[PDB]
Write an enzyme that holds these catalytic residues in place. Structure first.
Site, PDB file in Angstrom:
ATOM      1  N   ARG A 219       0.903 -11.173  -5.721  1.00 42.42           N
ATOM      2  CA  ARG A 219       1.361  -9.893  -6.266  1.00 42.42           C
ATOM      3  C   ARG A 219       1.434  -9.837  -7.786  1.00 42.42           C
ATOM      4  O   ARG A 219       1.601 -10.855  -8.450  1.00 42.42           O
ATOM      5  CB  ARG A 219       2.743  -9.556  -5.715  1.00 42.42           C
ATOM      6  N   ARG A 253       7.794   2.256   0.960  1.00 43.96           N
ATOM      7  CA  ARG A 253       6.650   1.686   0.285  1.00 43.96           C
ATOM      8  C   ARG A 253       5.428   2.192   1.026  1.00 43.96           C
ATOM      9  O   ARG A 253       5.381   2.155   2.258  1.00 43.96           O
ATOM     10  CB  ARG A 253       6.689   0.155   0.330  1.00 43.96           C
ATOM     11  N   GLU A 270       6.013   1.397   4.943  1.00 42.20           N
ATOM     12  CA  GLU A 270       7.274   0.809   5.402  1.00 42.20           C
ATOM     13  C   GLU A 270       8.495   1.592   4.934  1.00 42.20           C
ATOM     14  O   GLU A 270       8.791   1.668   3.736  1.00 42.20           O
ATOM     15  CB  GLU A 270       7.364  -0.653   4.951  1.00 42.20           C
TER      16      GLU A 270
HETATM   17  N1  LIG Z   1      -8.508  -2.070   8.033  1.00 40.23           N
HETATM   18  C1  LIG Z   1      -8.332  -3.037   7.053  1.00 40.23           C
HETATM   19  N2  LIG Z   1      -9.303  -3.288   6.155  1.00 40.23           N
HETATM   20  C2  LIG Z   1      -9.169  -4.227   5.217  1.00 40.23           C
HETATM   21  N3  LIG Z   1      -8.067  -4.967   5.123  1.00 40.23           N
HETATM   22  C3  LIG Z   1      -7.037  -4.792   5.973  1.00 40.23           C
HETATM   23  C4  LIG Z   1      -7.131  -3.795   6.990  1.00 40.23           C
HETATM   24  N4  LIG Z   1      -6.078  -3.965   7.815  1.00 40.23           N
HETATM   25  C5  LIG Z   1      -5.362  -4.967   7.399  1.00 40.23           C
HETATM   26  N5  LIG Z   1      -5.911  -5.518   6.267  1.00 40.23           N
HETATM   27  C6  LIG Z   1      -5.423  -6.712   5.519  1.00 40.23           C
HETATM   28  O1  LIG Z   1      -4.411  -7.440   6.282  1.00 40.23           O
HETATM   29  C7  LIG Z   1      -3.135  -7.353   5.609  1.00 40.23           C
HETATM   30  C8  LIG Z   1      -2.031  -7.006   6.617  1.00 40.23           C
HETATM   31  O2  LIG Z   1      -2.430  -5.844   7.345  1.00 40.23           O
HETATM   32  P1  LIG Z   1      -1.219  -4.786   7.378  1.00 40.23           P
HETATM   33  O3  LIG Z   1      -1.759  -3.486   7.771  1.00 40.23           O
HETATM   34  O4  LIG Z   1      -0.544  -4.619   5.948  1.00 40.23           O
HETATM   35  O5  LIG Z   1      -0.155  -5.266   8.520  1.00 40.23           O
HETATM   36  P2  LIG Z   1       1.197  -5.977   7.935  1.00 40.23           P
HETATM   37  O6  LIG Z   1       2.371  -5.048   8.232  1.00 40.23           O
HETATM   38  O7  LIG Z   1       1.414  -7.326   8.656  1.00 40.23           O
HETATM   39  O8  LIG Z   1       1.105  -6.250   6.348  1.00 40.23           O
HETATM   40  C9  LIG Z   1      -3.261  -6.274   4.540  1.00 40.23           C
HETATM   41  O9  LIG Z   1      -2.414  -6.531   3.427  1.00 40.23           O
HETATM   42  C10 LIG Z   1      -4.750  -6.311   4.187  1.00 40.23           C
HETATM   43  O10 LIG Z   1      -5.022  -7.242   3.135  1.00 40.23           O
HETATM   44 MG   LIG Z   2       3.960  -4.216   6.782  1.00 37.94          MG
HETATM   45 MG   LIG Z   3       0.938  -4.975   4.369  1.00 35.63          MG
END
Ligand SMILES: Nc1ncnc2c1ncn2[C@@H]1O[C@H](COP(=O)(O)OP(=O)(O)O)[C@@H](O)[C@H]1O
Ligand SMILES: [Mg+2]
Ligand SMILES: [Mg+2]
Length: 297
Positions: A219, A253, A270
């Site tokens: 981050r 967020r 979130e």
């Molecule tokens: N459709 C997508 N395309 C590209 N990257 C994704 C996608 N979905 C998830 N990711 C990657 O996986 C990570 C976690 O998915 P996320 O949707 O944020 O579920 P979580 O709540 O566990 O963070 C994201 O921060 C991103 O880097």
């Molecule tokens: Mg999340």
């Molecule tokens: Mg995430």
């Protein structure tokens, strides 16, 4: 008017927000106590209100946490009322966002009882342009059970999908957003419907199968542009409208990714227990404590 800030032993060490949030609470005069949701020695009736900060192991026992929240709502006030909680802890909210005109990542929800492999194949059939796709539970966080697959890996992914349905979780299928490999994502934090700050978070799903977890080194402070803040604010307004909320979300967020179009689209959002990245802004924590101070009037 003691305020309970909910966490859990396993998660407290990675809740970078707790230290600064406690100081901010101190500055706005509110007495806060950090509480583990699995600590049976806590008398939740003692609190004026409760805020869910980092009970992040809920991703391992969703039903258990939801039950906890439900029981707590009977003995004290929840800043994020149950309707919001149930809705915010399930990525199926992405369809509600889409219905409100909020741009989201093309998302396909697979329900328990579905044929795992057929579901994956129909998905790929509808999106022949997706070179890669992602499998993830609708009720998770911190990269839990999230994986990246080349479209030729439908069978293996269907097995990943099946494993999730078996636990009784809904599964989301999304095409892999290509810009994330080089531009990661942007996470914007809001307080009472007002933009506070954002950060850039690197990609989590590596081409080689590795799945990272969003640690501090992943981050860095970022200044969200107009478009991003515009989309984030729409997502929040859609949430307020959808749930019939009388007040803005104390905090939230909204995570954005860049489409091929270049415009931003919601990855996830979130509103219940979000990591807010308070330590990446110079006054984010104060804005959070103040927003909380207004709810306790
Ligand atoms: N459709 C997508 N395309 C590209 N990257 C994704 C996608 N979905 C998830 N990711 C990657 O996986 C990570 C976690 O998915 P996320 O949707 O944020 O579920 P979580 O709540 O566990 O963070 C994201 O921060 C991103 O880097
Ligand atoms: Mg999340
Ligand atoms: Mg995430």
């Amino acid at each position: 008017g003691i305020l309970a800030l909910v966490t859990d032993a396993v998660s407290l060490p990675i809740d970078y927000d707790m230290p600064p949030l406690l100081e901010a609470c101190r500055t706005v005069g509110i007495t806060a106590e950090v509480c583990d949701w699995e600590d049976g020695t806590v008398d939740w009736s003692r609190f004026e209100a409760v805020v869910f900060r980092s009970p992040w192991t809920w991703a391992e026992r969703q039903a258990e946490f939801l039950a906890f929240c439900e029981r707590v709502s009977h003995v004290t006030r929840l800043i994020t009322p149950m309707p919001l909680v149930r809705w915010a802890l399930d990525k199926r909210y992405l369809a509600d966002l889409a219905a409100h005109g909020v741009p989201v990542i093309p998302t396909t929800v697979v329900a328990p009882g579905s044929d795992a492999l057929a579901a994956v194949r129909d998905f790929l059939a509808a999106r022949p342009e997706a070179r890669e796709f992602v499998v993830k539970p609708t009720d998770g966080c911190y990269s839990k059970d999230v994986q990246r697959y080349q479209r030729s890996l439908a069978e293996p992914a269907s097995r990943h999908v099946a494993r999730l349905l078996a636990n009784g979780s809904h599964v989301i299928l999304q095409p892999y957003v290509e810009s994330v490999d080089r531009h990661g994502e942007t996470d914007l934090t809001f307080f009472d419907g007002v933009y506070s700050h954002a950060i850039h978070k690197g990609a989590m799903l590596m081409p080689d199968g590795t799945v990272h977890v969003p640690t501090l080194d992943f981050r860095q402070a970022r200044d969200a542009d107009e478009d991003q803040r515009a989309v984030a604010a729409a997502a929040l307004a859609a949430s307020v409208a959808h749930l019939g909320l009388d007040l803005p979300l104390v905090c939230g967020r909204v995570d954005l990714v860049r489409g091929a179009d270049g415009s931003p689209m919601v990855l996830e959002m979130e509103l219940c227990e979000p990591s807010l990245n308070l330590t990446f802004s110079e006054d984010g924590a104060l804005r959070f404590a103040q927003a909380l101070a207004e709810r306790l009037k």
